[PDB]
Every structure is written in structure tokens, then in C-alpha cells.
Design a protein around this ligand. Structure first.
Ligand SMILES: [Cl-]
Ligand SMILES: [Cl-]
Ligand SMILES: [Cl-]
Ligand SMILES: [Cl-]
Lengths: 285, 285
């Protein structure tokens, strides 16, 4: 198999590094960013660097599109006419369900023998590499599952309309990032009078089975670390909600909240040592 | 003891009914609403009906103010000059911390020997009656606790500035009602493609210790019942957050979400039988 990556950022290269160690695979890549940003990491993993999307698409039988959500459609339009017969095109982007369907239609118009896997990456790549849980739909989902399970990939196939995996991912992130925004808002408010611990004790006493204090402390700990990517992700979730006909009232407000929280984090000369001090810096901001 | 109620709605009368069965107490009441709305329920519990706030305040040594948050301050201003020497004035309203402090100041200016209990009612009254968990601050908190623990009341005294109990209540409701709004939004979106169950299974597999599926199903069940009061409460929480210097981004959006959810509920000729059908009616709305 000749595997080609369109986009070779941190996530994409962690996947490529994982697949290299998992078995024998011929890998090629192209990233629209400056050569210095992606070419050293790619050559280090033994990945053949390319000059265009057209080049990757013409040389590889399997394509992984790992670009930004905004570039997902244009990259498929560029790739479509260069894809070989019976190619597998796998879109891993965080684009909306309607855009996953539009992408499948671009691949179908340009290379009718090709198959399409609309892949939803279920959580951050970093802790798992190539083994990050994936949920996939599209006429190439089963094929993508059978091919990449061989390398230890974790792939579930969703048996519905294309874009379903994309919506499941975005609704899961709306809950997780929305919970993070909710705790940061209500707990920064409680800390205006040093009550965050008492609010959390109150939640735990009323819903003991759910361990809300532990959940809030974990979500705030992660915030005190990866503050930036979670704000961005909630902005993409709000756009997906809007695309399926749900006005993203809560999701957009969460996105505004996490954005404001990251500006407070960024403004500090020195980040707070712990979750308690972080909730206090937010109260004092 | 001669106990007087200002406001005799469902919550206030459930408390009065509880105290009657808990022991011997002389109770009086006044409610600004039409006589037909409160007088039958009061006479039934053996509560002496009054013609004014001034009348209750002049005849009783303990006052419970259970009016709306918007009326809390004006009722204290009316009561203050009629309070007997060493009276205990207990404000149970869902007003902001700054308003609980202003009320304590009104009681102090008019009757300096009087004591003040700024009472936060920690959850809905209905399941508990007089035994609803209360958290209280103010110079009369200990006195309120010692007096009403005798009747089986559940009272915790908060050892800080007046208004602290009010803020703890509002921040706990911001989380609980905010979680309800978040699930209703993200799960109505998931149901646009019948994925709410899969989103919940995904949350449960990633955070098993927290039982999020069970928590979401409970919060949505309660919504399918008491939809109206929870929307209102989140509107009051957003106002308290704003009063302590936190822009209520998430809380206000939650309030808008629960409001929209109640309009969908209200518009149905016949309410859905279950949580699943309710999430589907919201997707289809
Ligand atoms: Cl990632
Ligand atoms: Cl909506
Ligand atoms: Cl209530
Ligand atoms: Cl703020």
C-alpha cells in the first residue's frame, strides 16, 4: 500500500509515526505550510515529501486528508482528478456533516471507482497516535476499517448517512468542552467569595454517583494545560450545530467563555501552580 | 414563637405545613396576590391571614420573607420599621448577594436590635417541605439554625460575608441548569441524525466513573416535567453572576436554550411519552 497524507501537522505525523512502527507501509506527504515547518519531521519518519496535492493523489492508492476544516473541500476538489482507479480517500477533518457529504460527492464525480471514508477523530491524537479512536461512515468505511485494523487502528463503522460520524464527534465535543466552559464560568464566579470548593462539595453531596467535583477538577486541570485547542474546537462545534439546524446558543457562549479564559491564561506573566489558584486568578481577573 | 410569612406561595405553604406537624408554632401570613390565591391554603394550615407586610412585621418575632427576588428589597423596607425589638428577619429569596447585604442593612437601620438570616434554599422545596436544605449567613444565622433545627430543619451556617449562601446557591444552579441546557442542545442536535444514544454511549465509555449517560437522561427527564421553573432559575443565576462581576456568557445562553425548549414543550398538543421521544421532538422542531 502507498499511503499519502495531505497535511502533515502534529496529529498527522503522530499517525504516520504510529503506522511506521505498526508495519511495512510506503508513505508520502504534502503540507501547504512552509517546508521548514513539516519536511524535517516527514523525512525523519521516512515519508516521501511532495510538491502538491495533485502529486500525492496521483502516486498513492490511499489518501488521508488531515487539513483544517476550512480547507477540507478545496483539498478534495484538488485531489479528485488525480486519484488512481479504486483509490480510497479518507477525510479526517473536523468539517461539518454537510461538508463530509460534499467531499464524498467530489470524489465520486472525479473518480467514480474510488471509495470514501468520512473519518471522525474521536479525541485528541497525541495520547494515542495511530490508535486514536476513529468512527467512520461513507462507502469506503468498511474498507478503511479492514485495511487499518491490520496496523492496530481503533475503528468503528457507523451504519448510517455520510456525515453521521462527524456529527457524533461534534456533539460529544459540545458536551465535553461545554462542561469545561460551564465549570470555568460558575466556579470563577463562586471564587469571587472563595466558594468554588463549597459549590463542588454541594454538587457531590446531591449527585454522589456522578462524581462532579472530580469531573470539574479534571476539566479545569486540562484547561490549565490545553486551553487554546479546546476553545477553537468549541467554535467548530458551534458551526456544525448551526449547519444541522440547531442555533448554537450554548455552544457559541461556551466558545466565547473558553476564549476569554485563554486570554486571562495568556496575560499571566507566570501561570498558576494548581487548579485552585487558576480558579482564583480567573475570579480576580 | 410567633412566625410570620411574607409571601404564601407553594414553597412557603409547604414550609408552613411542615413546621405545623413538626411542633407547636403560632403562624401568620400575608401575600400581595389576590385573596382567593392564598387565603384558603393558609386558613387550612391554621395560619392567621394578614392585610399588610406592616401587620405581619408588627405581630411576629420571626419573619420569613419568601417573595420573588425582585420584591425582596422593597418587602424588607416595608417590614423594617414595624419589626419588634430583637426580631429575627430571615430572607429566603433568590435575590443576588449584593441584595441580601442591602436587605440586612435595611433591617439594621430600622431595628438595630433585630438579627438577620440571609437564607439560601439549596434545591426545590416540594420534595422536602420544611426539611429543604438551607445554607445561611448573616448575624442571625446561628440563631436561625438553633431555632429551626428544633423543628427538623436542615440548616448549615456559612462562616463568611453576608450573600455567600446566595452565591453558593446560584453557582450550584448555574452548573445544574447549565448541564440540563447543554445536554438538551447537544442531544437535540445529535438526534437530527438519531445519534443522541451514541453520543451518550461515547461519553460513558470515555468517563465511566462519572455516569454521564445516566446524568443526561435524569436531567432531560426532569426537563420533560419541570421545564418552566428551571428556565426562570437560570435567568436569575445569570443576573447573580453579572452582579458579582462575571459576564454570564454561558448562563444567559443556557437560559435562552431552556426558554426555547419550554416553548417547544408548550407548543405540543400532547407531550412525548419518554426522554427519547422528547429529544426527537426537539430535533424535529
Ligand atoms: Cl488532536
Ligand atoms: Cl435551536
Ligand atoms: Cl421551590
Ligand atoms: Cl467574565
Amino acid at each position: 500500500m502507498k499511503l499519502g497524507f495531505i497535511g502533515f501537522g502534529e496529529a498527522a505525523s503522530a499517525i504516520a509515526s504510529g503506522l511506521r512502527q505498526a508495519g511495512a507501509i510506503d508513505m508520502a506527504a504534502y503540507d501547504a505550510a512552509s517546508a521548514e515547518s513539516w519536511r524535517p519531521r516527514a523525512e525523519e519518519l521516512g515519508v516521501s515529501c511532495k510538491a502538491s496535492v495533485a502529486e500525492v493523489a496521483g502516486e498513492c492508492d490511499v489518501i488521508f486528508s488531515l487539513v483544517t476544516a476550512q480547507a477540507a473541500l478545496e483539498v478534495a476538489q484538488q485531489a479528485g482528478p488525480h486519484l488512481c482507479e479504486g483509490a480510497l480517500y479518507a477525510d479526517f477533518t473536523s468539517c461539518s456533516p454537510a461538508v463530509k457529504r460534499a467531499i464524498g460527492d467530489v470524489i465520486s464525480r472525479h473518480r467514480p471507482s474510488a471509495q470514501y471514508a468520512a473519518v471522525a477523530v474521536m479525541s485528541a491524537v497525541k495520547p494515542h497516535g495511530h490508535r486514536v479512536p476513529l468512527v467512520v461512515d461513507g462507502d469506503g468505511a468498511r474498507r478503511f476499517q479492514a485495511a487499518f485494523t491490520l496496523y492496530g487502528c481503533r475503528i468503528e463503522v457507523l451504519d448510517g448517512e455520510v456525515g453521521g460520524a462527524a456529527l457524533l464527534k461534534m456533539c460529544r465535543s459540545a458536551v465535553l468542552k461545554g462542561l469545561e466552559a460551564l465549570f470555568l464560568e460558575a466556579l470563577a464566579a463562586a471564587e469571587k467569595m472563595g466558594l468554588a470548593d463549597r459549590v463542588l462539595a454541594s454538587l457531590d453531596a446531591s449527585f454522589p454517583e456522578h462524581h462532579l467535583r472530580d469531573l470539574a477538577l479534571y476539566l479545569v486541570e486540562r484547561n490549565l494545560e490545553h486551553a487554546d485547542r479546546r476553545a477553537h474546537e468549541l467554535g467548530e462545534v458551534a458551526a456544525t450545530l448551526c449547519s444541522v439546524g440547531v442555533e448554537p446558543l450554548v455552544a457559541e457562549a461556551g466558545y466565547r467563555r473558553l476564549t476569554r479564559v485563554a486570554q486571562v491564561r495568556a496575560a499571566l506573566k507566570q501561570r498558576p501552580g494548581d487548579v485552585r489558584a487558576w480558579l482564583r486568578s480567573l475570579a480576580n481577573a
